[PDB]
Amino acid sequence: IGTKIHDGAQGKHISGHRNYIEGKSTLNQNINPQELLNGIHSGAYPVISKGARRNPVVDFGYPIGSDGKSGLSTNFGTIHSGKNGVHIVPANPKTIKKVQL
Amino acid sequence: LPSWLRVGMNIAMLGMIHSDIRLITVDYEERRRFLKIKNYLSREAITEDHEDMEYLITELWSMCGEYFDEADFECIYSNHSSMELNQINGAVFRRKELI
Structure with a gap:
């Protein structure tokens, strides 16, 4: 997991951001993605799972955004680390809560 | 294709389709x-x-x-x-092209 938010990638998921794409899953307006990321490294927010492409999934324990397909609030984020930095995508809670045997 | 996958691809492809993409397919192995x-x-x-x-x-x-x-x-x-x-099979995006 990287240490710096890539603002251009993260902004796709922030309403009103210059990079925002309407329809995508969105972080809540009061959510600072760099503070969330700093909290992953400080141990405040645990990595609980991995998704496709080995992306960590973090349980922040309180609402961080909403899913674009379900419209539902979520406490979970998928962590995408690339060469230009990190962005957090709100994850459908069913992605975490519907667990295969 | 299952509906969830057409929904998910519909949203995810917003903002990344450029003129040189001819076709995007998905194969789902359930x-x-x-x-x-x-x-x-x-x-x-x-x-x-x-x-x-x-x-x-x-x-x-x-x-x-x-x-x-x-x-x-x-x-x-x-x-x-x-x-x-x-x-x-499996197209979720297909560019208009002359036949």
Whole structure:
């Protein structure tokens, strides 16, 4: 997991951001993605799972955004680390809560 | 194709379709819970194509990961006829091309 938010990638998921794409899953307006990321490294927010492409999934324990397909609030984020930095995508809670045997 | 996958791809493809994409297909392996995404281009692949596909899979899994655990992708330079690309299974995006 990287240490710096890539603002251009993260902004796709922030309403009103210059990079925002309407329809995508969105972080809540009061959510600072760099503070969330700093909290992953400080141990405040645990990595609980991995998704496709080995992306960590973090349980922040309180609402961080909403899913674009379900419209539902979520406490979970998928962590995408690339060469230009990190962005957090709100994850459908069913992605975490519907667990295969 | 299952409806969840057409929904997820519809949203994830917002903002990443450019004029050199001819066709995007998805192959869903339900027992393996695996997705294969193929991006057929009218030019050789570039690194930005691979970045865009990684972004797309992150979004798609964040929305639809209850249905799949892993995914792979391929970016393919295709000069095959419009008729041929029109008939490939699993299309979630297909450019208008003259027949």
